[PDB]
């Protein structure tokens, strides 16, 4: 042991002594780039390359202060890519714009390609850092929606992917089925239906159970609990609202989306507005009972 | 409790907040108001308060597209809406209003305009963001004056925690500084980590030699 | 696996099928409720 530890300590105690006598010269030693520091270092070298392209591209005789504004346009062009907003600056010079667009696509490609690489680590199990997983889920959530917005736009542009032939084929098929089954179609919940408060109470407990399993509550969860308690205290008022919604509204508040991070595959999760969930939950209960 | 009906004071606080904090940080906006959530402030903007939301009267090409789309896209009121260029609430209540005209025209259209459908029954709106605000009352009260005062304050309180706290050392000391300088004025610390720049010319770059003898210049000090 | 069933079902076709088995006011509520603004973070689009 001492054979090999002798030169190691000779070096180490030398370094200890030398900084103890000479002082520590180490100001301006090159800091290397490591795990957390990569993403800030990419932004340094991007902005430096962008700036060098700006100054070479502008002709001789221009006030250079314009260059720092161009770096702002770059940052906005990235955020619009990230958030899938279409970016267009109306007066921006076309060499400046075309230069910006290239760097945004380089940042883009690096950003998505690192999302893919990190997810293979999370699938394989080569990473155990919760911040990397939580970061990467954010990237993949954006990359999903970025393609889902394409898919929803393409539908209106490309039209119904199902032909009118196929659609009438499946429609008539269910008529011939349900006719031969003598299926009596589900009526609208009568104004004095015998079962309503039981189906409602079943709906409420399916909603309330999701909060027994949680230690903390926030403003959207609190308002749901208030609605559940109000529905318990005056169910004939709750049922009056619920039935009125199905007759008299067709425009609904926006649905938030989130993803649930099972390491092999993400599941999409939606939060419907609490006042609407109580109506869907009764209807869900009503539909399945009647069916 | 959240939301309620909108008040004209709230809409203009929202306008001021939007035209400062920017059109997509609604939580920073909603903490300026009471009663509303960020989602309700966001909804209030795009669904009715935003400029360009086309609150002019409807016209027969709009109605044609509305009735054309309502056949092609039954119930898809968020997809119909871009194509008519109107908000989904406008599309739907117009469509319902046009059916109300078409349904009363079955028979007794004059009394059938009047004896029921003249107004909603006074139930709470499921989204009053779609509706014009209540005008502000003839005089203000605590629920509005407080948020107005807090709104007015925050709208230019742009100093951060660091700047707000430590800049106070100027005012709290400088009077006392002049008073402690007043001891110097009336009773009458070492530094060594750096050169005193007033002792000798720092890092003096001497002027190069040139063809004109500089010592012919005689300068008189000010 | 009947892949992408929920992703690909056309709401106009779904509505017509729902019109068969249930009252049209419910079937119109159901399909309209599928047709709503999706939101995450600063990203928004209509589910069509």
């Amino acid at each position: 042991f001492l054979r090999g530890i002798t030169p190691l300590l000779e070096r180490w105690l030398g370094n200890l002594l030398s900084r103890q006598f000479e002082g520590r010269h180490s100001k301006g030693v090159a800091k290397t780039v490591t795990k957390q520091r990569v993403e800030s270092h990419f932004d340094l070298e991007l902005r430096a390359a962008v700036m060098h392209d700006i100054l070479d591209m502008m002709p001789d005789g221009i006030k250079q202060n314009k260059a720092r504004v161009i770096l702002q346009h770059l940052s906005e062009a990235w955020r619009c890519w990230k958030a899938n907003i279409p970016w267009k600056v109306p007066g921006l010079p076309t060499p400046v714009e075309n230069m910006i667009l290239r760097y945004v696509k380089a940042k883009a490609d690096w950003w998505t390609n690192s999302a893919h690489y990190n997810r293979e680590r999370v699938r394989r199990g080569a990473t155990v850092d919760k911040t990397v997983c939580k970061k990467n889920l954010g990237r993949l959530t954006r990359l999903y929606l970025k393609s889902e917005q394409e898919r929803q736009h393409n539908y209106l542009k490309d039209g119904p992917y199902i032909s009118a032939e196929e659609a009438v084929a499946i429609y008539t098929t269910t008529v011939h089925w349900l006719e031969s089954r003598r299926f009596s179609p589900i009526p609208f919940p009568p104004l004095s239906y015998k079962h309503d408060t039981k189906l409602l109470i079943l709906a409420l407990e399916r909603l309330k159970e999701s909060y027994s399993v949680k230690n903390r509550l926030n403003q959207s969860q609190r308002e749901e609990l208030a609605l559940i308690e109000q529905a318990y205290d005056n169910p004939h008022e709750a049922l009056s609202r619920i039935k009125r919604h199905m007759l008299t509204q067709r425009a609904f508040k926006e649905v938030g989306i989130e993803f649930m991070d099972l390491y092999t595959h993400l599941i999409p999760v939606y939060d419907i507005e609490p006042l609407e969930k109580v109506t869907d939950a009764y209807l869900d209960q009503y539909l399945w009972y009647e069916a | 409790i959240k939301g309620g009906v909108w008040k004209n004071t709230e809409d203009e606080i929202l306008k001021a907040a939007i035209m400062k904090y920017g059109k997509n940080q609604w939580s920073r906006i909603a903490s300026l108001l009471h009663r509303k959530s960020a989602k309700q402030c966001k909804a209030r903007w795009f669904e009715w308060l935003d400029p360009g939301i086309k609150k002019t009267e409807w016209s027969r090409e709009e109605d044609e597209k509305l009735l054309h789309l309502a056949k092609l896209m039954p119930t898809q009121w968020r997809t119909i809406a871009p194509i008519v260029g109107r908000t989904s609430a406008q599309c739907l209540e117009r469509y319902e209003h046009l059916l109300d005209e078409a349904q009363r025209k079955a028979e007794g259209l004059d009394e059938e305009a009047t004896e029921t459908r003249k107004l909603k029954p006074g139930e709470i709106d499921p989204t009053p963001e779609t509706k014009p605000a209540r005008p502000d009352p003839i005089d203000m009260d605590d629920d509005e004056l407080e948020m107005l005062s807090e709104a007015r304050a925050r709208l230019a309180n742009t100093q951060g925690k660091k700047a707000k706290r430590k800049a106070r050392e100027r005012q709290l000391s400088d009077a006392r500084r002049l008073a402690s300088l007043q001891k110097r004025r009336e009773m009458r610390k070492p530094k060594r980590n750096q050169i005193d720049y007033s002792e000798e010319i720092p890092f003096e770059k001497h002027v190069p030699a040139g063809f004109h003898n500089p010592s012919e210049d005689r300068y008189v000090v000010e | 696996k009947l892949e992408k069933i929920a992703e690909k079902m056309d709401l106009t076709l779904l509505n017509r099928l729902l019109r068969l088995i249930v009252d049209h006011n419910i079937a119109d509520y159901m399909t309209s409720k599928n047709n709503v603004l999706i939101n995450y973070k600063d990203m928004n689009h209509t589910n069509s």
């Binding site: 008529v175 349900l178 006719e179 299926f183 179609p185 | 027969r60 109605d63 044609e64 009735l67 309502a70 056949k71 039954p74 046009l98 059916l99 005209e101 078409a102 349904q103 025209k105 | 019109r19 068969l20 088995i21 249930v22 009252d23 049209h24």
Partner: peptide, 29 residues
Amino acid sequence: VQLELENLMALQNTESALKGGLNTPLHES
């Protein structure tokens, strides 16, 4: 537009095909 309003109310607010009953008539638009 009232012609097509009356036309599509025969398409929308009818009871279901599985009930039978006579079709509402429509108009040529």
